[PDB]
């Protein structure tokens, strides 16, 4: 053994270094047996539930096809129709479904409804995620910048820029620490993650050799570094008209070919966990290219990045799928 | 053999005591197969398609549990766009897909429609329901009584608390009358079932050994009974402005703890084939807590009842998917 | 080999005379193999993405039913959420897409997307299809008029009646003229495919020994024919006020009883890529039929047609299952 | 362990209160397997020998589905052509034929014979049977009463009525007092089992809580029971030519509607070892029919009780098979 | 689907030109599959019953291979004791022996009874045969004329050549009608099939092309025809002192090498179900050689054309096999 | 290879002494395999007819359990209903048969009809037997009289006492010819095999080291050898009142523990091919008995020596079965 055999993956902020790296070696080996065609099904007979109230293709796509590949077999329940506090209640819905089900995904807004559903369903239930946000992107991230730099987890620097407060800004500042890696975050001080959580970042950052600054300045914090880290700060929905001062803020911090060469190195690469802003071509970014004729071209990445080799987004979106494997066998799975 | 090999179920008003033994205790052993991993599976390479009108996702996940348990495959077509009498007709889309399908599962309002599907697919068509209702949460909750109380068919007694016209009052009396149970309805006059239909229920009763009060003296038809049944009787859209007279009607009918101790016996269990309204926290149940501020605790069952262990709701809304498993077993199956 | 191993399937108007009865070959073998027992899964542990923009339940169904039969796993993404140009692109998400999935599907209205999806996705896209339209409603209509003749591919005659631009008229002219049956298209000269076309179907049409005529008499049109065709010209929509002139001209067009006994044979055949308006019993056929009582049974095929055995339009819908089946086949499959 | 791996079943008058219910617990769950499919072949390879010399297919076919669905092979030999006692011997025959087949099942006349078969052959012997009579219709019907009455063995009563001596009268005795069931015979004083039988049967009865009446009043012998049992009583072949005294003596003991509605109860089901005289459909019973007229609807059993509910004789004749299944599974199989 | 799952062949005067064409291509396949090595079992732990009350070797043989192939298991019950009316009643014992069986098949005189073993069986009952005669002949003979000329069945014209009242002679003018091929009876008017079945076949005969002559002249009707028919028209029994004029009116009608060089085509065959009284070496064939020396080297086929390559009656033989084996696996198996 | 794949055993004068040592080396390695369970079904999915003409209750047991321990099917047909020549014709008979089943297993007794079915069937004929005799016998004594005495092929000696005529006297005497055995015939001259055979069996005995004595003198035929054979000489028949000369003719030759004893050797062996007139307790042994005193004992072999040790008859019996299976799997086997 030496196991996490029925734990809950519902968001964890609480995990030693060694259950992460017992989760990333896992999916490392787990990417590298469906390659091979090594990968036994470990999951057969087993029939899992994906409950979710916002819509999220490529969350449902990744645990709909780590569910498949080992044997596994799924329910989509959508937004359309769990009309879930409307007349049942997570609390009462869990209790039923954790009789026909065994293990169960949940995708929503409220990390408190998260809550319930793992306390009450009686099986297995992993978050996908909500806006507390995300314990696989996270594991699928370090997973990408481990097998592409091909050097030890704590020989990997990466930089993260601008809003590190939209919180993949914090949840990249938490694993670099735990794992001991050299995280750099590059943000205007109005939108550094809010000094407490800096201060529990200190406090695993010492007992791993993690190195963690938090800059404003976007050629020093992407000083040498390998991966660079973007995400998209313009709130669709907060209206548009306007997003003037948010883009005069963060448009220094676009990540584009300046700051990419700006790193040293000739192997950095650009990571994003997309959608990116990147250019015109969709009606989002139709909308902004003519209030703002100046971006048009990409907002938080440039298209002369994005499209071209500096960018591993789309092996980082696939290095999704092998992690929720690695979270369903470790979970569920007879081994 | 004695087999129902291709007979649809789609509701039978018609059935054996002899079917309907077989049928549960088909359940019955399909349960316990699962459990103790003895299971085989039976509908390999058989792939069933799901109509389904109104969403119903409890009644979709047994379906879709029970159908892949036997290696079966299932394709679930919504209410969104399933636009059957639009340009299409159910004799029409029927035809084609019994030309795809394997069997087919049904669920929407109008039973005259089930029947055309019936008629005209060509492979057996299982209404998994409509308001003309249920032939397996009719079989669920008897799998339910008995294999709880541990006695025979015949020395299980019952009550069903009020307003016996929506039809789980017709049908827990129907099934309790070819059984040879001990049904008791206990429901204000004006809710009763229409004496016809007790008269059937009486023709049945007798060559079983049956007995079937209907009172309206909750306290009386509730006295030494195993299990007390109840069900929502406030029609969500017969506006709320003034449930008023529903809610001075129904509201001594009750479950309660006056109600469960009001049975001799101390394991009388409470069912219910779920929602439950039994208290505030869903939104329908805010409202209702406004405009009445003395449900706001349980409308039909109090929490006092529901959330502690008179409640058995959630094993008999798992043994729904046991029951359709009967039912996709003795249908499809090479047994 | 000779093999179309990876090979998009996304329409083709470009494939070889020797491709095409290949791919016919292979479906009437695999439907021959489901049939007999005798077919063995060849896709197991391939999983499908289907990305649907208009909802398609029978080109759905089609595409489940065939990668169930041989082991693939399929899963379908709606057009409810799958918010494709909204913020994304399908650029970027066959890009993500293609490292999940192992072949997609589609089906929207814009070919020109199409496009995009089979560009970049880096994996088999199988157009289900687009206005542009359909390479397999074209092969599972000659799939079946082949199994029904019995005769060999060129000597098949058969005939489209009216309106032959809504491009069924297209698609049927250019598959007789590549395989060398004789196709006759029977409409108004104001509704011909455009001359260039047919001079395309021309050239091919002499490479192999294809007969094409083209009149504006029905009578003359279907002579001696086997198979008679037909599909619904009334474009729900543009409003309905008036369908009149569209009325007008093709209402002498209309298959029915005169045109079926018209042909010569007592074994001709109608088909039609259903839905076809052929009564009232639908909720756009009681519309019509009150605006145009003349109509109100039947449309472009009459019900005295369509409900009695000239009608094989449900054994071809099934057929569209066998050839999607050819098309996964000899594209993903180990063989 | 816990078996009786390798115990002929040659008609035992001697076994265990323990060993019986083991037989009927195993015949119970090797029904349940069959039907719910869970049932594993456990004597594949084996091959067994049938050697009939009366012809009786009843017994055939139960040995043979049995063998078969637990993978074994079946050789029946005759009663043309096993000139058994001609030119050969016993004796020397089941010593050639124990060193072919892996058990022999025996269905003769003479249980003298079944013994030296037993004796000599060197590998199980079942005793299909003999006028000594039956081991396995004894473990069938009580089977059948166990599993439709719903109650332990000890709270199922049931009655046999007249010539308790033609031995189903004391094949039912023997078996209600091992097993403690309340057993009561109806027949007349000249017809009861020779007293020290039942002196045997009230020596079992006593250590068991087994209660035997002998009445010659049907009406009392039938109050309150579960089951009624029956049997032809009438010796086709001593001549028929006034069967008249026998007919007017077992007359009375005519289990019909009367009898029937005497039991006390609406569940009392009527059971009978087939063939039953039941009318004249048939070319014994149109002799009878003419000689006597009010016979002619049934002699033993008449039709008005036997074509309809109250008749589990089907039932019945069926559970013969899963009882000889428990016997070659105990006996043979590898568990 | 597409299925005709657990419907009784017995007999079928009702079927769609639709159901017969999917038995033949069935068992087309069927024949293929066996010689290929293609043939997967899908009959696998299914039992079948075979009650013969006339012994048929070429019937038993038939069904024992064909339902051995798939994997089923057979118990073969004589004539010589089923005592079936002696005391027992077909209604009886169907119900006892579809309790054990998975179908049955039958084999009697008198198609009256074939009718209530299907009624009560519970179980599929295919009628292998009565007086009233034979569904699998007719299909063996079908599959046999269209593998054999290599022609669609609409091009293939057969005759059959006198006593067109011996069923033989009705059953080819029945499938030659629903199917749609030239079918021609050459028999004396007094031995035509009666004018009301003609009228029948020729309401048949019109909605499928087929072409029905009736003639008296053998050289007109065998003219231009692929396989000519016959049968034994002596009627062992009626005693044989004088068959003489029997033999004197279809003498004319023998099958021999002026009929078949008659035929136009060097491609004709005769076919003939077995026996065929072909020569004297025979005993009943030397019997009537004695009395009648001018047979005595065949009476209705000569042995010039009876062993001499004219001659497919043993493919058509074997033929029948792979039809019984068409028609367990539409009924039964797991597809 | 090396291999007599496809050849008929229809009965073998002519053979190899390397053929016949190949057949006997496989019998023996397929009885040990047996034994041990290292034996694997190479005959699954062969199905065989057995046609016997007589019943032989002990050569259709083993050719049964033969060709089901290998896996294969086997139907058994009558001498009750295979009218034969009646109405047929064994080459008509063969030739259907040859194409439904895989071997035919054949057992009359006119030898002339075997090779019809030889040389018409299509597919290999066994000879299990005729008047002119087996083969299978032939080796399955001499693989007894090889494992019993555990010495090489031409260091066994043994006797025939008695009727070297009725050809267990020929068929000893040519296998102890061919495989170079020491073979002893004790016969009275006028019953010694005719002279032209023993000249054959000489220039057989020639080449191997063949010994073969043929005396009239019991005691010095059976000196010193390694089992005694002999066989019933009375033709129950021939009617039986006075067998008198026959009695007083072979009853110096009837083995008894005086010739038994007067071998040299505590281990000589008495062998019989069943079945033995060796006691009364047969109803022709009492007959006899009656009629004749002296016998009702022992015919040709007495009690004192066929019940008790020097007895191998029922090894000798089941190496029956070990031979056949040697012959279908070298003749039929995918080996």
Redesign the interface.
């Known amino acids: 053994a030496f196991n996490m055999h029925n734990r809950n993956l519902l968001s964890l902020m609480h995990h030693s270094t060694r259950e992460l790296r017992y989760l990333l070696d896992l999916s490392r080996d787990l990417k590298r047996a469906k390659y091979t065609g090594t990968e036994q099904q470990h999951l057969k007979?087993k029939?899992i539930?994906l409950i979710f109230e916002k819509?999220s293709?490529?969350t449902?796509?990744?645990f709909?096809?780590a569910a498949?590949?080992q044997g596994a077999?799924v329910?989509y329940?959508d937004?359309?129709?769990?009309?879930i506090?409307?007349?049942?209640?997570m609390?009462?819905?869990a209790?039923?479904?954790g009789?026909?089900?065994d293990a169960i995904g949940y995708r929503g807004f409220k990390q408190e409804i998260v809550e319930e559903l793992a306390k009450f369903a009686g099986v297995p239930v992993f978050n996908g995620l909500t806006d507390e946000y995300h314990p696989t992107q996270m594991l699928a991230d370090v997973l990408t910048m481990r097998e592409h730099s091909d050097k030890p987890l704590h020989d990997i620097s990466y930089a993260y820029l601008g809003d590190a407060r939209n919180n993949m800004g914090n949840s990249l500042l938490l694993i670099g620490a735990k794992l001991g890696m050299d995280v750099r975050i590059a943000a205007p001080k109005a939108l550094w993650p809010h000094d407490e959580f800096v201060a529990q970042c200190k406090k695993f950052a010492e007992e791993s050799g993690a190195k963690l600054t938090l800059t404003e300045d976007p050629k020093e914090a992407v000083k040498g570094v390998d991966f660079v880290h973007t995400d998209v700060w313009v709130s669709?929905g907060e209206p548009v008209e306007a997003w003037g001062e948010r883009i005069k803020e963060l448009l220094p911090y676009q990540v584009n070919m300046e700051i990419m060469k700006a790193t040293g190195n000739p192997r950095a690469k650009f990571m994003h966990c997309?959608?990116?802003?990147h250019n015109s071509?969709?009606?989002?970014?139709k909308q902004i290219a003519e209030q703002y004729p100046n971006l048009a071209n990409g907002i938080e990445v440039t298209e002369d990045v994005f499209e071209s080799p500096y960018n591993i987004a789309?092996?980082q979106?696939?290095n999704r799928?092998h992690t929720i494997k690695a979270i369903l066998v470790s979970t569920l799975a007879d081994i």
């Open positions: 007979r029939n539930a819509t293709t490529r449902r796509c990744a709909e096809v498949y590949d077999n329910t329940i937004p359309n129709s769990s009309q506090g409307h007349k049942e209640s609390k009462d819905t209790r039923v479904l009789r026909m089900y669709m997309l959608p990116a802003f071509e969709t009606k989002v970014g789309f092996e979106a696939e799928m």
